[PDB]
Amino acid sequence: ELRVGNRYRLGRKIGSGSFGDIYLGTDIAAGEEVAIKLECVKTKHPQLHIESKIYKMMQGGVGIPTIRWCGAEGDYNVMVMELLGPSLEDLFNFCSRKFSLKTVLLLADQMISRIEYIHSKNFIHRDVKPDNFLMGLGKKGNLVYIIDFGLAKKYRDARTHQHIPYRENKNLTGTARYASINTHLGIEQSRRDDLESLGYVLMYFNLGSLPWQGLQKYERISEKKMSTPIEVLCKGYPSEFATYLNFCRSLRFDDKPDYSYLRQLFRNLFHRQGFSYDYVFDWNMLK
Numbered sequence: 001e002l003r004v005g006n007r008y009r010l011g012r013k014i015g016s017g018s019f020g021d022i023y024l025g026t027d028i029a030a031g032e033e034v035a036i037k038l039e040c041v042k043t044k045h046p047q048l049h050i051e052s053k054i055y056k057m058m059q060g061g062v063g064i065p066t067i068r069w070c071g072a073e074g075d076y077n078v079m080v081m082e083l084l085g086p087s088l089e090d091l092f093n094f095c096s097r098k099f100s101l102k103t104v105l106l107l108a109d110q111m112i113s114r115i116e117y118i119h120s121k122n123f124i125h126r127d128v129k130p131d132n133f134l135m136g137l138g139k140k141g142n143l144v145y146i147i148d149f150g151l152a153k154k155y156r157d158a159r160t161h162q163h164i165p166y167r168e169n170k171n172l173t174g175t176a177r178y179a180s181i182n183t184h185l186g187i188e189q190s191r192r193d194d195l196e197s198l199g200y201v202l203m204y205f206n207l208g209s210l211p212w213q214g215l216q217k218y219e220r221i222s223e224k225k226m227s228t229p230i231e232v233l234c235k236g237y238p239s240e241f242a243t244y245l246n247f248c249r250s251l252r253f254d255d256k257p258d259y260s261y262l263r264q265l266f267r268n269l270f271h272r273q274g275f276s277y278d279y280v281f282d283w284n285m286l287k
């Protein structure tokens with residue numbers, strides 16, 4: 001019965017982050033559950049405080065989790081955040097690893113907006129993937145949150161807006177399955193690459209699986225990914241998915257994406273399909 005100082009008592013492991021795991025906590029003062037991350041103070045390169053600072057900078061944005069506390073306690077740096085609902089990977093598995101197009105579109109609208117918002121705060125996420133999007137609880141059950149800023153990087157100076165310099169020979173950060181082509185080529189990640197990754201996430205949700213799943217391991221995914229044309233990958237699915245991916249791959253390193261354009265592609269498709277904008281996801285139809 002490990003206790004994070006007075007305030008919180010730790011519970012089971014619930015998650016796996018880019019640096020360190022996530023535990024269920026109880027706030028003793030509140031009669032309330034929370035999510036807790038721990039870092040040994042002796043860690044060679046501490047990042048827990050650094051990551052909390054990002055969350056705090058972002059606070060108030062739609063779909064950004066709130067940090068309850070960040071501090072040192074005994075031999076650990078601790079981050080406590082508000083508890084959220086399941087990740088989209090978790091939900092994918094409950095929905096037979098296939099989402100309806102309606103669900104995909106409702107998600108793609110929110111997810112594009114979260115990536116826009118982070119970019120508005122001068123950061124890129126760099127690990128866009130299903131596991132890093134979580135649904136809210138209660139009244140926020142309809143809301144998609146983005147999480148985990150452990151691989152996040154500032155892409156421009158906050159005052160001047162000077163963009164980070166172009167570089168090559170970078171080792172890959174984030175999941176290779178959803179990595180952009182340029183990431184596989186060693187190019188420094190920029191705003192383009194968050195969006196491209198999301199496009200593979202979206203097709204992943206459409207397909208159940210990507211062609212580069214389940215095949216030096218890197219060189220293999222990179223090959224298959226570069227060897228599959230977007231036309232091929234998206235075949236049988238509305239052209240918008242391929243238009244999305246093409247647009248992202250066209251963007252130059254420091255280019256600002258047109259987020260509206262990409263949201264509009266999907267809004268218009270949504271309209272042509274006659275779906276209700278009621279935020280009824282596939283998992284809400286489960287019973």
Ligand SMILES: Nc1nc(N)c2nc(-c3cccc(Cl)c3)c(N)nc2n1
Nearest residue numbers: 015017022035037081082083084148
């Ligand atoms: N159900 C739930 N709630 C959360 N709030 C949560 N949070 C994270 C996360 C990621 C990075 C940093 C921190 Cl503190 C938490 C995670 N991996 N899983 C989570 N699962």
Ligand SMILES: [Zn+2]
Nearest residue numbers: 049052070071
């Ligand atoms: Zn701190």
